Amino acid sequence: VDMYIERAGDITWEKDAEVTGNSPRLDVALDESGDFSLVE
Amino acid sequence: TTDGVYRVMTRRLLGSTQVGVGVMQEGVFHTMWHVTKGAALRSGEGRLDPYWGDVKQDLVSYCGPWKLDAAWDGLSEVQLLAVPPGERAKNIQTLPGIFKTKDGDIGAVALDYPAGTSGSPILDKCGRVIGLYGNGVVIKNGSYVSAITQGKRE
Numbered sequence: 269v270d271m272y273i274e275r276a277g278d279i280t281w282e283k284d285a286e287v288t289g290n291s292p293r294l295d296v297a298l299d300e301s302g303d304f305s306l307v308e
Numbered sequence: 309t310t311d312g313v314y315r316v317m318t319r320r321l322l323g324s325t326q327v328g329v330g331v332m333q334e335g336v337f338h339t340m341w342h343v344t345k346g347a348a349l350r351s352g353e354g355r356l357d358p359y360w361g362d363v364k365q366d367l368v369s370y371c372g373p374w375k376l377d378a379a380w381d382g383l384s385e386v387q388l389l390a391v392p393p394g395e396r397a398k399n400i401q402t403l404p405g406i407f408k409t410k411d412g413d414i415g416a417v418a419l420d421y422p423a424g425t426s427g428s429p430i431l432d433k434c435g436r437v438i439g440l441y442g443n444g445v446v447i448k449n450g451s452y453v454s455a456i457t458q459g460k461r462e
């Protein structure tokens with residue numbers, strides 16, 4: 269068995285978090301392979 | 309077996325490479341299908357066998373059924389608990405955008421990380437996992453926008 273897991277942290281909301289990223293509204297299509305493409 | 313966020317590593321490429329990330333909750337390991345392609349996983353001396361998965365949803369669970377059932381409320385900021393290759397886990401707060409599809413709308417997070425960050429959890433203000441980061445689109449500016457991908461709890 270090749271692949272292995274290793275703990276990286278707790279799942280907790282952090283009050284001090286950095287705030288970033290925009291909020292785009294995008295038209296997309298999902299194919300049978302689970303791949304999204306822009307309908308643009 | 310402790311609840312929390314985990315890296316998914318392989319030795320099949322150069323050295324030890326991080327192919328993705330996942331969530332341990334209620335004894336079940338949750339990640340994106342494209343991270344493991346459904347292969348078994350090692351945790352120390354233990355084995356984790358796939359239990360459920362779906363290529364089109366791009367999700368997989370190990371040791372039991374998908375447990376994560378919280379959903380983005382469609383209004384509030386969220387946190388990506390990003391776990392990049394070789395880097396400390398860090399919370400990034402953001403207001404999701406929207407993917408509009410023929411089958412309905414899904415939240416989306418516009419944060420650019422390397423592909424081995426796939427499976428990092430997205431959290432609500434209660435610390436509930438509302439989906440996994442790592443399946444989305446490349447936009448004009450070359451950056452990633454990820455769906456907030458969530459499974460169904462049977």
Ligand SMILES: O=C(Nc1ccc2c(c1)CNC2)c1cc(Cl)cc2[nH]ncc12
Binds near residue numbers: 424426442444
């Ligand atoms: O490629 C990425 N995800 C992905 C790979 C294979 C498949 C799917 C998604 C869904 N079907 C097969 C990816 C992930 C992240 Cl976190 C950042 C990225 N920047 N450019 C690509 C990606």
